[PDB]
Homo-oligomer: A and B are copies of this chain.
């Protein structure tokens, strides 16, 4: 047979991905130490493997460690703090999250003719800026996974001509909608793509030519580092200490429980910040419009399609609608548009 293909996302909110065979996984970017589980196995059945990933990671050097990752690390109070996780792409913590989705997307008993073409990504301004460290790490990568409670290993090792990078959401509109939007693109019109993530937020536009082929705008597209969904979590934390006034702080779970709900269950009571929830949501999306028109002068008048994506874009649709109503819309998977955009435009390989 031929060599296999995997597209995953290294997004700091939740690690996303979808393979060649349209199996997809998603889990928050939280890791923890792993400890052996037989007791809770007896009480509650682990029905979703992704729900309860306890994982061991092998190496030739014999430096294996058990890890709780994702949802199983989210229940941990001893997990990663996640509000200040470092953006070192070559870090050992990023090795845990990346090696997690590998065996999840590799089906059981693939032959040796199959070799995994990984397709991952960088931020837009960090694409050229942070290319070589991840190029070094994926060249460096040589491990073997071990699933606790499911008991099947995957030797994971990558040569060159098996790795592929693209910028964040590059093929999300260069592919995956580009056959669909051929009805809408006509002549010299900018289509708009916005990806609202946790740490960072990217807005990317493609100029089409007279020949109806898209071309990239590096001066009409940039990376909004420091503007993202993490600012809502940083605001709603400070609003909770404004609402509790004890000095008490939510943990890593209750903070991430808040900005989906707005009504935290604290001291047996619903400490409410519903007004401060919506105000922080109109805070962030308005701060995007200034950064949108910071790259968009009179050229906003030539737009024909505004698309938004990202998990933040799911919960800021009407908040970010005021860029251009009756034109802005929502992509089918706001979160998975990076990975499928890495998939379909990765199907050049």
Interface residues of A (CB under 8 A from B): 2, 21, 23-24, 35, 37-40, 42-44, 58, 61-62, 75-77, 106-114, 124, 127-128, 144, 146, 151-155, 167, 170, 174, 186-189, 207, 214-219, 248-251, 253-254, 257, 265-268, 297-299, 301-304, 324, 326-327
Contact = CB atoms under 8 A, between A and B. Distances in A.
Identify the 7 closest CB pairs spanning chains A and B, nearest first: A43-B216, A112-B152, A44-B215, A38-B128, A40-B216, A62-B112, A109-B155
Nearest to A108: B112
A308 to B, nearest CB: 17
Contacts of A251: 297-299
Given A62-B113, A109-B155, A251-B298, A167 B257 contact: no
A107 to B, nearest CB: 5
Contacts of A207: 75
A268 B216 contact: no
A218 B144 contact: no
Contacts of A2: 146, 151, 153
B265 A39 contact: no
B109 A268 contact: no
Contacts of A249: 298
A39 B267 contact: no
A265 B112 contact: no
Contacts of A21: 108-109
Contacts of A106: 109
B39 A216 contact: yes
B219 A77 contact: yes
B302 A266 contact: yes
A301 B108 CA distance: 37
A62 B248 contact: no
Contacts of A112: 58, 62, 108, 144, 151-152, 155
Nearest to A2: B151
Nearest to A213: B44
B218 A113 contact: no
Contacts of A124: 39
A174 B265 CA distance: 22
A114 B218 contact: no
Chain B CB within 10 Å — which of A112, A128, A219 has the most? A112
B216 A186 contact: no
A266 B152 contact: no
Chain B CB within 10 Å — which of A2, A76, A207, A301 has the most? A301
Nearest to A302: B265
A126 B251 CA distance: 31
A170 B304 contact: no
Contacts of A268: 303-304, 324, 326-327
A304 B265 contact: yes
A189 B265 contact: yes
A124 B38 CA distance: 12
A27 to B, nearest CB: 13
A301 B326 CA distance: 45
A54 B248 CA distance: 52
Nearest to A124: B39
Contacts of A186: 265
Nearest to A257: B188
Contacts of A217: 75
